[PDB]
Amino acid sequence: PGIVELPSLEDLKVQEVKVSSSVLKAAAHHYGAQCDKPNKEFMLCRWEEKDPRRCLEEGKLVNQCALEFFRQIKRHCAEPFTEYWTCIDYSGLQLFRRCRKEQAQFDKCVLDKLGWVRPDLGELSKVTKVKTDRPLPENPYHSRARPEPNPEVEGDLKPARHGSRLFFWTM
């Protein structure tokens, strides 16, 4: 069959978010509050194209808006955030419930110096609508033409011509 088409290694170069999972999980609610639009453009493009090769520019926009988010944390509230993700980072399950005072300090400093509001319980699982400029994928499964169906039955049902026609049975 055909040759698979892959992007070059230059097209896969982006400035990664080289932080740990507790750094992300500590920042995850404000990240979902603030980096909404490129993330949902990317996930809409990702569930519609069904191909990670058509989604690389939205992936780079996600990977860029996340860096802008952490730079904007780093300019104002580096120390409460650092204490908070260290407390998140101690726990083996990384519990939010063990870390409520450091979360309170980080949310206080984030609401004061950046105006960011933490999402309530129920908001980051809402289904949101995304305004895109890319076209809707018209055949994302790359399905070929379906076979034409068998003909339907039509007409009125007449009696059997001379009955059963089983050897001599005249009905």
């Binding site: 990664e16 499964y141 399905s143 070929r144 068998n150």
Partner: protein
Amino acid sequence: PFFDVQKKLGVDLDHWMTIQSAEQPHRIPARCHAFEKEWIECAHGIGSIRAEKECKIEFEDFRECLLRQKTMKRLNAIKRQRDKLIKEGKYTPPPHHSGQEDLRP
């Protein structure tokens, strides 16, 4: 004597476990969901006789998704040629195929 009582009464006794492309708990996709969906939506309504000779490509893609025989045969060819070139000394493995390049994310 397939007495299709389920389609007669409208009950769903076992149509849910019948295929991989059905409704799954927590919307978990099967690893060959698209291939099975393509083969079923091809072969739907045209019968077995037309489905074996008109939907052959979709069923071959789906069987090769399931069993991965051509994929494993292709990897066997590449790996055997690689090991022959390593034994002959005419090929070197790159550092990113030896654990020396500080992986992506």
